DNA sequence: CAGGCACGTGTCAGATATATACATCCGAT
DNA sequence: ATCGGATGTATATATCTGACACGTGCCTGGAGACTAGGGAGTAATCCCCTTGGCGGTTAAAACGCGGGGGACAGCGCGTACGTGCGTTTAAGCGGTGCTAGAGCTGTCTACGACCAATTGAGCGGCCTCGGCACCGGGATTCTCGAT
DNA sequence: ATCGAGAATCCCGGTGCCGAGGCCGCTCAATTGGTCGTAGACAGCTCTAGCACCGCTTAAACGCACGTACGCGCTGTCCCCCGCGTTTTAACCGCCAAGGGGATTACTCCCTAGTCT
């Protein structure tokens, strides 16, 4: 069937950073698994936050708090800053 | 004295039956409608109606809104809903209920024109119900029902003189009209501990004299079909009526006649009287009740008067069995 | 009506699919309703993490005189960094190997 | 069939190579039985969960996805496959 | 002398560098596959294994054993010793929480 | 008034069922409540994950039984599976 | 019988576990056989914990379960200690254990 | 009140009693500073998550449930508090 | 002048503190330390008493486990006196470093 | 959707835990 | 052998608990018999992927043996850490007083679920040549007994 | 305390190879445009408990005295594991069958929804 993968997006990001590098199939699969694992961790933590705070919706606040609570230190700071920038750009239309 | 209040509540109960498929609301709504319809007063406030049993918070708030505005916003919305109205109109057809109407509306079948154009999607019972939609919804005058009772009794006695046939229900109670026929039959050779073709002979004989026009289902215990009185060669033909015939063992026949005679309130009162007199009465027979609630061997039943004497209660005519 | 359709990721200036992230969030049974700002934030975070790890992997591959990232380069990039190592402490990379680390006592004393 | 007495297939040079990748200088002679025992315990623990996973699905072939899930259950999170 | 014999210990650091630089399995395929099949035979009879599942088990087992051996070496260095012993693995497993 | 939720009465009933002549303190009541909540959360999370894994959209007794088998160790898992199957059989038999 | 718990012969509330299974958004549909199984499992686990605590409570001429008794019951058993190896209970203390090396000559 | 030093409030007899409960016999003189350091780093690790949980709820009071949840997030589940 | 041999009083207090369940840490200094550590992340915070108590119990459990592992390492090192290298080894093996 | 009642919460007499005096009992110097 | 902490025993606080009183939101709620569809079980076949058997090569495992460097036991020492005692100081308990913010409730309103309708991005299939694996030899570098 | 000899490794170059990357033809999930029900953002209240302060009380903490035992360094014994050479051996690759497991259909058969007294 039509199995879904982040392969094209990982390749696009790779050409956005290192224009003259390649990537093998095993490395691409490892990147896909890493993306899936991080997504599962962040989504589960956000869902737990929503249930814990008696809320029924997960919003940018829940995702931002989950990112600040999972990612360590300066990585979390950069992720929060760039996520806020992306949300502002999207809501600016 | 609640014609406006009771009528608007009637269609409300249907939606949880045919659309929402929630019996737990439909039964409560119809019980509330029945208890309000019997109350001989103008209803002014919902809190006043809360005194009556079976009326709760939701019914009170809704009757208050109906008295304030003359309608219900939920009811008005759901009236203009094409899907819900189509489902209700389909469920008006016999054999079509919640699942059938839901599926038909899902596949675009919403009107009787679609039912007539889609004969292949209907079984035998659904096709019979579609053919006689108008006829089945008509009421039966008592004189016509007397005529067809005489015809049925004549045919059953023609099959065999030992047969006993009783037309129970509102007719037996003496009501001027009824929506269907409940025919109860027994045979001396057929008891609880004793032929599968006894009903078949009667069905074939009634089909021979062209009284029964259609067959919905025919088994060894009960038969459901359509019958129609013949016209006298010059008048308009009588509308088709659905007739139900049930075969009961001899030791259970009189109890079945009592159960199917009615009314429902009368049957409930008789069951309560039996329970307080240490007996249990069901559709089949009557059992005595022990001190610990264990039911014993069922008592022999040979007449309705015997059943009344079992529970130490005076025999009541079916005309007096309103409640 | 029916204006020129544009992907919401293009509106947010992201490479990762915000729509697919939104669909996965809705179908993952995390909450019975999902806000509009969650998918873009999550996609931005994922894009940042992938960009960081891919930059480190590319640097390691260039230091290894290869122009094609292999799992060994990913393992080197993950374990060499400090924050990424703690983020991914409990993960084993297939065909990743082990970073060269010999205890000082085991070195030839001479 | 009836595979029996097969834990010995993990040869002593294989254990030596694994320890050298670990980074040890010299290896005692009594360590191989202990290493085989802990390997058997870990393999049994993972395989039991994998077999339980491949039984809820009503299937007779153990896929790599079930192995990855069983590893993730006890905190291993194997990347790569799947 | 007549042969060129390396001192005991250099032939350790040599190929420590090799086996830390390279990323092969270091365990033979068929013996491990047979061991996995024999272990799984105890739970349910007549079970088939995909090759990818066996490879995943091999990778996970090798990573776990490498980590355990690193912890054992650390414990041995702590004990003022360069030879690892079974009691060192016992101590490492007890501290890690597996025993 | 905020009606707080706890399993205190059921834990007390279970204690009287197996140890008729003893009592239990409030701190132990809180510990039992936390333990029951934690075990329920663990089993429910594992069952939901298994349901998503097997592409299903319904949690029935099969997922709960498999989650109990995975979470609880050998003897406890076997006894819990036996108790659950017996309870399900008794419930459906009525 | 009227309530669902008495029909299955359990002490834990089946309907409450059912309500939590809906509220806890674990899946959009939960079958009716899941809550009774979960309630039976929870009741059995609680029964084992309480029985082991009482077997440890009774010993010290005390007829009231204390968090110390719960800690002793969990740590002394092998199966429950593996089930709750990463759980610390308030006022629980530790098992009495002194190494033989530290013992006097 | 801006507090300057309180890690010295975890006195030497307190560390000694904790070690005795742990099961040791003799304690060296350098154990106290290392124990204070590891206590401080563990307290910061727990408190950061607890304060984040409190801030996400738009509250200014750190309840016991936030601390319990933060401890659960690190695998150190705590019973008897909620 | 009846002076006990060195170790016997330790073998006494070890049993005393293993059969007990008290806090063993003074509450006010621990509360002050918690407040000082928390004020570095967000100024002007207030704590529930149960929160401070839960922090104290969790910290006590962590430190008791750490000392258990430290004693294990020290006995493995052919000693009875724990030294900070034992604590560092236990923390590194446990995965905290 | 609706009553029946199973929990939740609050109260108070009181079994049970705890602390405080004296008489044995066992490890050290 | 005798003297300080563990034991036991009787008694007197004291205290936190389990049986009632009452309020309040969950929750469990017509059965039966005659008709159909429909999942389940069996039976029967098509891919086909993993399993099993036979045979040939050879890299890897097994075995023997000579050390030599480390595991380990014993001795001596010195100073760091234990136990004990007098003195201080700060936790702890118990009040008093204040108010910041947790908790609850009413109210709209902006926001997300949901459904036709549309269409462009991503996935499956199919090339193809270039980074990379491998081989070969020469140059470079690491290690070891010898002087 | 280096030096020549022996061995391990690096570098450079040549050669073949198979999958990384690109292109084409789709499918169906992402996107638009609306409607409609409700979660919660936001004010307003209570009133709980968290904080601040003060005054005994005494038990824990601290500083010092002093003894001794254990961590550590040193020395000597011996033993067993490592490095290397020789001898199996089954790991691995190649081929075949092959056979039931997954994937469909064919037929039937009891379970159950509907449906209506």
CATH of F1-94, one of 1.10.20.10, 3.40.50.720, 2.40.30.40, 2.30.130.40: 1.10.20.10
Contact C18, C39 (CB under 8 A): yes
Residue B91 burial (CB count, 10 A): 19
Number of residues written out for chain B = 323
What span, in angstroms and rounded, lies between the C-alpha atoms of I70 and I88?
9
Contact G23, A51 (CB under 8 A): no
Q: What single string gives the DSSP state of each residue in F40-78? A: HHHHHHHHHHHHHHTT-S-B-HHHHHHHHHHHS-HHHHH
Q: Determine F/B contact with 3+ CB pairs under 8 A as the test.
A: no
Nucleotide closest to C68 measured between CA and C1': K131
Chain breaks in chain B (C to N over 2.5 A) after: 194
Contact F55, G53 (CB under 8 A): no
Contacts of H5 (CB under 8 A, 6+ apart): none
- Pick from H9, H19, H51: CB nearest I38: H51
Considering only CA atoms, which of G56, E89, E4 is closest in space to residue D41? Answer: E89
**Tokens for B207?**
């089909």
Closest protein residue to K124 (Cα–C1') = A2
**Tokens for B298?**
């069922």
Structural domain containing residue H52: 1-81
Main-chain dihedrals φ then ψ at residue B186, nearest 5 degrees: -140, 170
What span, in angstroms and rounded, lies between the C-alpha atoms of C71 and A25?
9
Number of structural domains (chain E) is 1
Contact G95, G72 (CB under 8 A): yes
Q: Residue F70 — left, alpha, or beta (φ > 0 → left; ψ -120 to 50 → alpha)?
A: alpha
What span, in angstroms and rounded, lies between the C-alpha atoms of D64 and H74?
29
Distance of residue E4 Cα from the nearest chain D Cα, in angstroms: 21
The answer to whether the C-beta of I78 is closer than 7 A to strand J is no
E strand segments, E1-99: 48-49, 83-84
Tokens 């014999």 sit at which residue?
Answer: E5
Output the distance from H50 CA to L47 C1' rounded to whole Å: 26
Nucleotide closest to A27 measured between CA and C1': L20
Contact A66, A76 (CB under 8 A): no
Residue B126 burial (CB count, 10 A): 19
E31 within domain boundaries: yes
Q: Residue E44 — left, alpha, or beta (φ > 0 → left; ψ -120 to 50 → alpha)?
A: beta
- Last residue of some domain: B229, B244, B259? B259
Contacts of I68 in chain G (CB under 8 A): 94
The verdict on B109 and B148 lying in the same domain is no
**Tokens for H30?**
């350098």
Collapsed DSSP state (helix, strand, coil) of residue H75? coil
Residue D36 burial (CB count, 10 A): 17
Output the distance from C65 CA to L11 C1' rounded to whole Å: 14
Contacts of B298 (CB under 8 A, 6+ apart): B251, B284, B285, B286, B287
G88 and I18: CB-CB below 8 Å? no
Collapsed DSSP state (helix, strand, coil) of residue G65? strand
Q: What single string gives the DSSP state of each residue in I21-89? A: ----S-HHHHHHHHHHHHTTTSSS-EE-HHHHHHHHHHHHHHHHHHHHHHHHHHHHTT-SEE-HHHHHH
E57 and D61: CB-CB below 8 Å? no
- Pick from I16, I29, I67: CB nearest H6: I29
Report helix angle H31-56 to H64-73, nearest 10. 110
| Alpha carbon separation from B38 to B42, B52, B65, C22, E29 (Å, rounded) | 12, 11, 21, 56, 86
Strands B286-288 and B279-281: antiparallel
The CATH number given to A1-93 is 1.10.20.10
What span, in angstroms and rounded, lies between the C-alpha atoms of B295 and B292?
9
What span, in angstroms and rounded, lies between the C-alpha atoms of B220 and A3?
57
Output the distance from H30 CA to L69 C1' rounded to whole Å: 19
Contacts of F28 (CB under 8 A, 6+ apart): G53, G65, G66, G67, G69, G70
Considering only CA atoms, which of B269, I33, I90 is closest in space to residue H4? Answer: I33
Q: Residue I46: beta bridge partners? A: H61
Strands B140-141 and B222-227: unpaired
What span, in angstroms and rounded, lies between the C-alpha atoms of I86 and B128?
90
Angle at C58 between CA C56 and CA C63, to 5 degrees: 95
Q: Is B95 known as a binding-site position? A: no
Considering only CA atoms, which of I97, I89, I33 is closest in space to residue I59? Answer: I33
Distance of residue C30 Cα from the nearest chain F Cα, in angstroms: 11
- Residues 10-29 of chain F in contact with strand J via CB under 7 angstroms: 10, 23
Number of structural domains (chain D) is 1
Give the side-chain half-sphere CA count within 13 A for A85: 12
What span, in angstroms and rounded, lies between the C-alpha atoms of A17 and C51?
7
Angle at C48 between CA C43 and CA C52, to 5 degrees: 150
Q: Residue D27: beta bridge partners? A: E84
Contacts of E9 in chain D (CB under 8 A): 25-26
- Last residue of some domain: B123, B138, B153? B138
Contact B60, B47 (CB under 8 A): yes
C103 touching chain F per CB within 8 A: no
**Would you list which residues of chain G are within 8 Å, Cβ to Cβ, of chain I?**
67-68, 88, 90-99, 101-104
Catalytic residue among B38, B51, B62, B232: B62
Output the distance from E86 CA to K143 C1' rounded to whole Å: 33
What span, in angstroms and rounded, lies between the C-alpha atoms of C20 and C23?
5
Please name the residue of chain F whose CA is at the shortest distance from the CA of residue H69. Answer: F38
3-state SS of I29-43 is HHHHHHHHHHCCCCC
DSSP single-letter state for residue C93: -
Please name the residue of chain C whose CA is at the shortest distance from the CA of residue A17. Answer: C55
Number of structural domains (chain B) is 4
Output the distance from D10 CA to K62 C1' rounded to whole Å: 14
What span, in angstroms and rounded, lies between the C-alpha atoms of E67 and A24?
27
Q: What single string gives the DSSP state of each residue in D51-77? A: HHHHHHTT-SEE-HHHHHHHHHHTT--
Contact G8, G36 (CB under 8 A): yes
Contact B166, B257 (CB under 8 A): yes
Q: Residue B185: beta bridge partners? A: B165, B247
Considering only CA atoms, which of H40, B104, I89 is closest in space to residue E95? Answer: I89
Task: Give domain limits for chain A.
Answer: 1-93
Residue B59 burial (CB count, 10 A): 21
Structural domain containing residue I22: 8-97
C-alpha dihedral, G13 to D73 to E74 to D13, nearest 10°: 140
CATH number at residue B306: 3.30.210.10
Contact E80, I77 (CB under 8 A): yes
Tokens 């009528």 sit at which residue?
Answer: B7
Considering only CA atoms, which of G47, D20, G64 is closest in space to residue F14? Answer: G47
Report helix angle F26-53 to F8-18, nearest 10. 100
Angle at H51 between CA H50 and CA H56, to 5 degrees: 100
E2 within domain boundaries: no
DSSP single-letter state for residue A54: T
Q: Is B120 known as a binding-site position? A: no
**Tokens for B109?**
């079948």
Structural domain containing residue B270: 260-322
DSSP single-letter state for residue C15: S
Considering only CA atoms, which of D45, D65, A30, D77 is closest in space to residue E53? Answer: D65
What span, in angstroms and rounded, lies between the C-alpha atoms of F55 and F77?
25
3-state SS of chain B is CCHHHHHHHHHHHHHHHHHCCCHHHHHHHHHHHHHHHHCCCCCCCHHHHCCCCCCCHHHHHHHHHHHHHCCCHHHHHHHHCHHHHHHHHHHCCCCCCHHHHHHHHHCCCCCHHHHHHCHHHCCHHHHHHHHCHHHHCCCEEHHHHHHHHHHHHHHHHHHCCCCEEEECCCCCCCCCEECCEEEEEEECCECCCCCCCHHHHHHHHHHHCCCEEEEEEECCCEEEEEECCCCCCCCCCCCCEEEEEEECCHHHHHHHHHHHHCCHHHHHHHHHHHHHCCEEECCCCEEEECCCCCECCCCCCCCHHHHHHHCCCCCCCHHHCCC
Show which subunits contact C, needing at least 3 CB pairs below 8 angstroms: A, D, E, F, G
Contacts of I53 (CB under 8 A, 6+ apart): G90, H64, H81
Considering only CA atoms, which of F74, D50, C29, F92 is closest in space to residue G40? Answer: F92
Q: What single string gives the DSSP state of each residue in C24-81? A: HHHHTTS-SEE-SHHHHHHHHHHHHHHHHHHHHHHHHHHHTT-SEE-HHHHHHHHHHS
Q: Is B179 known as a binding-site position? A: yes
- Last residue of some domain: B138, B160, B180? B138
The verdict on B254 and B154 lying in the same domain is yes
Which method, experimentally, gave rise to this model?
Answer: cryo-EM
């Amino acid at each position: 069937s039509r199995k879904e993968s982040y392969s094209v997006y990982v390749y696009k990001v790779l050409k956005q950073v290192h224009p003259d590098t390649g990537i093998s199939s095993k490395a691409m699969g490892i990147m896909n698994s890493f993306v899936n694992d991080i997504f599962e961790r962040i989504a589960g933590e956000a869902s737990r936050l929503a249930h814990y705070n008696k809320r029924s919706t997960i919003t940018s606040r829940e995702i931002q708090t989950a990112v600040r609570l999972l990612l360590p230190g300066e990585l979390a700071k950069h992720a929060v800053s760039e996520g806020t920038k992306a949300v502002t750009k999207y809501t600016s239309s | 004295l609640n014609g406006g209040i009771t009528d608007m509540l009637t269609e409300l109960a249907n939606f949880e039956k045919n659309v929402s498929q929630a019996i737990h609301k439909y039964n409560a709504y119809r019980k509330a409608a029945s208890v309000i319809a019997k109350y001989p007063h103008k209803i002014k406030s919902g809190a006043e109606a809360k005194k009556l049993p079976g009326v709760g918070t939701k019914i009170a708030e809704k009757i208050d809104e109906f008295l304030a505005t003359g309608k219900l916003r939920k009811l008005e919305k759901i009236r203009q809903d094409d899907t819900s109205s189509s489902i209700n109109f389909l469920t008006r057809v016999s054999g079509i209920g919640p699942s059938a109407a839901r599926k038909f509306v899902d596949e675009g079948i919403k009107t009787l024109e679609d039912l007539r154009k889609n004969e292949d999607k209907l079984n035998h019972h659904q096709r019979i119900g579609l053919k006689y939609f108008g006829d089945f919804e008509k009421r039966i005058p008592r004189e016509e029902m007397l005529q067809m009772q005489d015809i049925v009794l004549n045919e059953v006695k023609k099959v065999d003189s030992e047969y006993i046939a009783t037309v129970c229900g509102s007719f037996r109670r003496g009501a001027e009209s009824s929506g269907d026929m409940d025919v109860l039959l027994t045979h001396p050779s057929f008891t609880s501990e004793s032929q599968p073709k006894l009903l078949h002979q009667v069905v074939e004989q009634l089909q021979k004299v062209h009284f029964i026009t259609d067959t919905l289902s025919k088994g060894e215990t009960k038969f459901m079909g359509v019958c129609q009185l013949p016209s006298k060669n010059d008048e308009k033909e009588y509308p088709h009526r659905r007739i139900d015939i049930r075969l009961i063992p001899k030791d259970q026949y009189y109890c079945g006649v009592l159960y199917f005679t009615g009314s429902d309130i009368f049957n409930k009162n008789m069951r309560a009287h039996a329970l307080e007199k240490g007996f249990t009465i069901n559709e089949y027979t009557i059992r005595p009740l022990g001190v610990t609630g264990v039911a014993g061997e069922p008592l022999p039943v040979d007449s309705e008067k015997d059943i009344f004497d079992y529970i130490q209660w005076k025999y009541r005519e079916p005309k007096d069995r309103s409640e | 009506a029916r204006a020129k359709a544009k992907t919401r990721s293009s509106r947010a200036g992201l490479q990762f699919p915000v729509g697919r992230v939104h669909r996965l969030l809705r179908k993952g049974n995390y909450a019975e309703r999902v806000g509009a700002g969650a998918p873009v934030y999550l996609a931005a975070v994922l894009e940042y993490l992938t960009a960081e790890i891919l930059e480190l992997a590319g640097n390691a591959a260039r230091d290894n005189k290869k122009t094609r990232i292999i799992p060994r380069h990913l393992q080197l990039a993950i374990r060499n960094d400090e924050e990424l190592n703690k983020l991914l402490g409990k993960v084993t990379i297939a065909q990743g190997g082990v970073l060269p680390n010999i205890q000082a006592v085991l070195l030839p004393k001479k | 069939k009836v595979l029996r007495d097969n834990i010995q297939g993990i040869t002593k040079p294989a254990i030596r190579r694994l320890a050298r990748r670990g980074g040890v200088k010299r290896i005692s002679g009594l360590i191989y039985e202990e290493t085989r025992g802990v390997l058997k315990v870990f393999l049994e623990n993972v395989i039991r969960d994998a077999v339980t996973y491949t039984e809820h699905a009503k299937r007779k072939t153990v896929t790599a996805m079930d192995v990855v899930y069983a590893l993730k259950r006890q905190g291993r999170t194997l990347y790569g496959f799947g | 002398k007549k042969p060129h014999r390396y001192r005991p210990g250099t032939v350790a650091l040599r190929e420590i560098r090799r086996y830390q630089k390279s990323t092969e399995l270091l365990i033979r395929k068929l013996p491990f596959q047979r061991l996995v099949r024999e272990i799984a035979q105890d739970f349910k009879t007549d079970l088939r294994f995909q090759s990818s599942a066996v490879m995943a088990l091999q990778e996970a087992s090798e990573a776990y054993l490498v980590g355990l051996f690193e912890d054992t070496n650390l414990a041995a260095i702590h004990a003022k010793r360069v030879t690892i012993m079974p009691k060192d693995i016992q101590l490492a497993r007890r501290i890690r929480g597996e025993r």
